Design a protein around this ligand. Structure first.
Ligand code: NA
Ligand code: NA
Ligand SMILES: [Zn+2]
Ligand SMILES: [Zn+2]
Ligand SMILES: [Zn+2]
Ligand SMILES: [Zn+2]
Length: 153
């Protein structure tokens, strides 16, 4: 199996450690971990295309979209590879991530390793909003924390 870790950091209090695992090179990817420092409620969770400046949040933003699709929720047929929906933070600001995804991969031509994991200020509207921007980013507001998806050491 192949594994990765992203350490999420930003300018504010949001931080977390997110794990990835994929048993077969074309198998589902499991994603898990906790993010703290969030406001209670839904927060957009995505893989950005950025693979150069993956440290800050400044250069991230455009979702990883190697197949030139429109933005959607993770279970939509039409979605970016980087569209991982929302995570939910509880009352004391902790969101637990538990995702199984069929579109991301840690191997091959479009591997998410090296790309930037991002947690955002607001809910991802899953591409169901009333403007073109919904179909690009889901209108999830500012990026609160991000980090490179690195191969596990
Ligand atoms: Na960072
Ligand atoms: Na964009
Ligand atoms: Zn490049
Ligand atoms: Zn770049
Ligand atoms: Zn390609
Ligand atoms: Zn997207």
């Amino acid at each position: 199996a192949t594994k990765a870790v992203a350490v999420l950091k930003g300018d504010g209090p949001v931080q977390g450690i997110i794990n990835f695992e994929q048993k077969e090179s074309n198998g589902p990817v499991k994603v898990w971990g906790s993010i703290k420092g969030l406001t209670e409620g839904l927060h957009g969770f995505s893989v950005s295309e950025e693979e150069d400046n993956t440290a800050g949040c400044t250069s991230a933003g455009p979702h990883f979209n190697p197949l030139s699709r429109k933005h959607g929720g993770p279970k939509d047929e039409e979605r970016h590879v980087g569209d991982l929906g929302n995570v939910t933070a509880d009352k004391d600001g902790v969101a637990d991530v538990s995702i199984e995804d069929s579109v991301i991969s840690l191997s091959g031509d479009h591997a998410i390793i090296g790309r930037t994991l991002v947690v955002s200020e607001k809910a991802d509207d899953l591409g169901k909003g009333g403007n073109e921007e919904s179909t690009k980013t889901g209108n999830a507001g500012s990026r609160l924390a991000c980090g490179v998806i690195g191969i596990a050491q």
